């Protein structure tokens with residue numbers, strides 16, 4: 767793993783150190799705190815706050831009731847169709863590893879050593895240069911393989 771970021775402060779907004787070509791991994795190890803209702807990993811085009819940077823890939827675990835993962839894309843400050851994965855491995859007070867693998871046509875995401883979901887590209891992954899992590903989460907490490 768390359769360009770590892772250790773224990774970043776959340777909210778984190780970092781420049782991804784290379785283009786996300788097919789086969790690239792983003793690996794994120796962390797922990798959901800006991801009072802967490804949600805957090806998010808956003809692959810974004812730039813880091814503008816107003817107007818809000820486009821989010822190619824919004825990966826948003828949610829913990830209310832039985833919980834779920836919501837995926838979407840933000841284009842021109844509008845959210846598109848939500849893709850909700852209900853078989854969620856995330857739990858409050860548990861550790862996790864997320865591996866996002868960028869393929870040509872989709873993202874392939876594995877959580878805790880197990881395939882979790884797919885997400886077809888809506889914005890070309892070549893437009894992504896920024897990783898954002900927000901909400902209630904404790905991130906121990908961010909690693910990249912190009």
Ligand SMILES: OC[C@H]1O[C@@H](O[C@H]2[C@H](O)[C@@H](O)[C@@H](O)O[C@@H]2CO)[C@H](O)[C@@H](O)[C@H]1O
Pocket residue numbers: 824826836837838845848
């Ligand atoms: O799709 C991701 C965004 O959802 C926004 O919340 C949605 C909510 O999930 C949906 O059920 C509906 O009622 O409308 C809300 C507004 O679009 C969150 O506010 C945003 O942060 C993203 O997670």
